[PDB]
Each structure stands twice: as structure tokens, then as C-alpha cells.
Amino acid sequence: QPELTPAQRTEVELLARGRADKSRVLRDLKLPETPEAAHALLLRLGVWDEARTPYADRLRAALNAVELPVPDFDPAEERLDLTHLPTFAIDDEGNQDPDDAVGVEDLGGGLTRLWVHVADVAALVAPDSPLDLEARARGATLYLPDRTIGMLPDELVAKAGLGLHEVSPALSICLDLDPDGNAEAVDVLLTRVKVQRLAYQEAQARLEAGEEPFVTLARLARASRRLREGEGALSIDLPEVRVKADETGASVFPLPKPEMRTVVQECMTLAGWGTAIFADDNEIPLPFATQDYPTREVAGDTLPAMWARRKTLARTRFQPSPGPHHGMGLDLYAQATSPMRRYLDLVVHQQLRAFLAGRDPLSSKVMAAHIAESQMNADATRQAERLSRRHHTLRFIAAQPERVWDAVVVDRRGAQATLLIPDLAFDVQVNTPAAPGTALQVQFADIDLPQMRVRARSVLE
Ligand SMILES: [Mg+2]
Numbered sequence: 001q002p003e004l005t006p007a008q009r010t011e012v013e014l015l016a017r018g019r020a021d022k023s024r025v026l027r028d029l030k031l032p033e034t035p036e037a038a039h040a041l042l043l044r045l046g047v048w049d050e051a052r053t054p055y056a057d058r059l060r061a062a063l064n065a066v067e068l069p070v071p072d073f074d075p076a077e078e079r080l081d082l083t084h085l086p087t088f089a090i091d092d093e094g095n096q097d098p099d100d101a102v103g104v105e106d107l108g109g110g111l112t113r114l115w116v117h118v119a120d121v122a123a124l125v126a127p128d129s130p131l132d133l134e135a136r137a138r139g140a141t142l143y144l145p146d147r148t149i150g151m152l153p154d155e156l157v158a159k160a161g162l163g164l165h166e167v168s169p170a171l172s173i174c175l176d177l178d179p180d181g182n183a184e185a186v187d188v189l190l191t192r193v194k195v196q197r198l199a200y201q202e203a204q205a206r207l208e209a210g211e212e213p214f215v216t217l218a219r220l221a222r223a224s225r226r227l228r229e230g231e232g233a234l235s236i237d238l239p240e241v242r243v244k245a246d247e248t249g250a251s252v253f254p255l256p257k258p259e260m261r262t263v264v265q266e267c268m269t270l271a272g273w274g275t276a277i278f279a280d281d282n283e284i285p286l287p288f289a290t291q292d293y294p295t296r297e298v299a300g301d302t303l304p305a306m307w308a309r310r311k312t313l314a315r316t317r318f319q320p321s322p323g324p325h326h327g328m329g330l331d332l333y334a335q336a337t338s339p340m341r342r343y344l345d346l347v348v349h350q351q352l353r354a355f356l357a358g359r360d361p362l363s364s365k366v367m368a369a370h371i372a373e374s375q376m377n378a379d380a381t382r383q384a385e386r387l388s389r390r391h392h393t394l395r396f397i398a399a400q401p402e403r404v405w406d407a408v409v410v411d412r413r414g415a416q417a418t419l420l421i422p423d424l425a426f427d428v429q430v431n432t433p434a435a436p437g438t439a440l441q442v443q444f445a446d447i448d449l450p451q452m453r454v455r456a457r458s459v460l461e
Helices: 006-016 024-028 035-045 130-138 154-160 200-208 214-230 259-281 303-312 343-356 364-398
Strands: 087-091 100-106 112-119 168-177 183-193 195-199 241-246 249-254 288-291 316-319 405-413 416-421 426-431 439-448 453-458
Touching: 006 024, 006 035, 024 035, 087 200, 100 214, 100 259, 112 214, 112 259, 130 343, 130 364, 168 214, 168 259, 168 343, 183 259, 183 343, 195 200, 200 214, 200 259, 214 259, 241 364, 249 364, 259 288, 259 343, 303 405, 303 416, 316 364, 343 364, 364 426, 364 439, 416 439, 426 439, 426 453
Parallel strands: 087 195
Antiparallel strands: 087 100, 100 112, 112 168, 168 183, 241 249, 288 316, 405 416, 405 439, 416 426, 439 453
């Protein structure tokens, strides 16, 4: 009802975005002078539609694309030509810029060479360059349901993304694995590959037809997982979704888990393990990913078991020297496969490329420093992303009031049960004595976007 003037609307907007901490307008209307209260008012007045999310702004996450000049790859740099091998960037349906690709080579005698090719980002982003500094200031690419704000310029992604061009330069990790999964050798080198893009479901279809390299990649991944599990490795693969938002509204799509998705994941793990092995052998400091023992032992792979396990996990800590990763069953590990979207991965590439160029990689001291600096930024970026995903997920829920969702009890707190709706990767508290693992049907009501809360209930129980 209160028709605010333009200047007033903006005043309220600055508060909703967290840029201001007060508002004479809200104060006057007997409304709380809080970002959430300003948000609700803007919705009630029609100034803002339900599509708008204030979380990136509130957390001071960068919403602007990086407008710095991007260097070209050096054509004279010698690279191992692998354009003759079938190579594939296999990703989620709807993905747009590949960081990685996989391939294999039979080496005879039961030995197989696994190739994990990664976008050669460090060839374009040198330590301390304006590109490196801005990427460090962001920590990670911000993937909102309605837009993507890269850690690096769009120009850079367009030129380094694998498979975006007929042939692509890459920084590759190669591991020679015997039938049992033991690595007889690991290498890191600059390459040139011809990559074909496929969604996980499409690679799965090829695996099912017995097509190579899918059949071989699956054999290697299975043997590798069995080895890591033998070393205490345990899973927290809970249901995932794609959250999208556009002109037509919000959408939440369940992410299928074909075997090829698991296989590709294992190839990334092998690549990170090899990278760490390589760095350890050559005394190259990297942001090694470590994880100490969990709070308590939790067995099983059911939803409730994985739900509990995730809560007991020790935090993943990145340090300049190798350390065991309990969750992965590895003695050492480094994330090296997503340099376009994660700053730590880019640092791994910068360190490896420096070594390859016969130069001096950053010392452990500067490494500990850059890890600390980037992580604070990555934390804020990731939180802005998580809040934004929940926002649109609620819009999706609110658009289908009549829908009944399938849920599972994954935890309990008194008379309260935590219900996870897999198709939404969304959980809510609901009164019910149902034991963990119990399948229930739930309906949602009273969605409040500014506060992002909803009331759920077990139906026809
Ligand atoms: Mg990928």
C-alpha cells in the first residue's frame, strides 16, 4: 500500500543488499531495519520480483565479470601431440566449460596408461599477474542459478576450455597402472589433444555398448576405488541437483548417477593423487589437501549413513606439504583438475608449470599465505552460491503447491526428524517418530523467501 518514492525504494534497496544497515522508511513503517525486512517490503511493493537474490551482494562476492586482458597460448612451446587419441570431456548435462578430459593407452603387458588432461590455465595466468590477483580475490567461480560469474575472464575460459576448439592445449597427468591398480609411473607434461564433449548419460550409453575408451576407463576406476576403499576410504555421495533460474522461473533437476559419472570422478581422484606424487617426488610445494580422522566411525552407504558421516568429517585442510586424506584413503592428494573454477587448482598448475619451465615454484611460506588469503574469498563465494541455490529451490517448491515429494529420514533430533527430499537435495525438519531410512511423502507450504524458510509436513502418514 505505501507508495514509496524512487529515492525511498533505493534507500530500502541499499538495505536489502546489505550495503546500508538502516532505513528511515522501514523505521517509519514500524518495520525492522534489517536486510530481510527490506527484502520482504520490496517484494510486497513490487519493486523486486522473486527472481532477485541479495546474497552475493550481502557477502560482498564479486558479481562483475573479470575485465582483464588475456594472453594467448605460446605456439612455439613444445607439447606432446596426442590428437590421435580418442579423448573425452564428460560432464553434467547442461555444463558449459570443460576443465578436464580423459583418455587411455594400452601399453601392453596388462599395463594401461590413464590420461587426465586439464585446461592449461597457468600458461595464461602467471603468479602475481593481474589475472592471478583477481582470481585470488574471488577464490572460485560463482555459479548462480541465473548466471555464472567466473573467477577468470570469459575470454580466458573460451580459449582454454577443453573441447571448445578442434584441438586444445593442456597440462596433463599420466599414470601407468597395472591390472591391480598400482601406479608404476606418473608424469606431468604439456600436451595438445582433440577433445570430444559428452554428458555423463551419453558416455554411459557408450560404456553399455562396450565402446572404448569407456570400457577401459571403467575397469581402471573400479580397481582404483577398491584399492582406496581397502585403505579406509568411505563415501558421502548424496543426491545432487542442478538449480536453474531464467525467464520461465526456477527449476531444480535431479542429477543422475550413472556409473560413468563415478568413473570420471575416480579419474579426477587418480589425477590429483598423481599430481601429489609428482610434487612430493620433486619437492614442489602445493596446496595438498589433507583430512584427519572423523569424529567417530560411521559405517554404511545408505542415505542416513552418508548423512551422519558428513557431519563427523574432519575439515579438509590445505597445506604446503603432503598429508593423509582419511576420507579418500590416500596418503597424499592435491586437487588439480578444476583450475578455471577453483583458485587452489590454479595454484597447483602454476607450481607444476614453474617446475616444468625449470623455474622456482613458490616456497611453502608464500603457499601457506596464498592458501589463507584465497580460502576466505572462496568461503564467501561458496556461501553466496549455497544461499542463492536455496532461494531458487524454494521458488521451485512454491510453484508446485500440490506436489507431493518423496523423502527419507536421514537423522533425528528429539521428536523431530530430518527429512531429505533427494529430487531437491533439500532437507527440512518435521515432527515424526519415523526411524532413519523411512520413506515418507511430504508437502511444503508457507514459503517465505526473504527468510528462506518453509513449513513441511509428512502427508498421509
Ligand atoms: Mg569436467
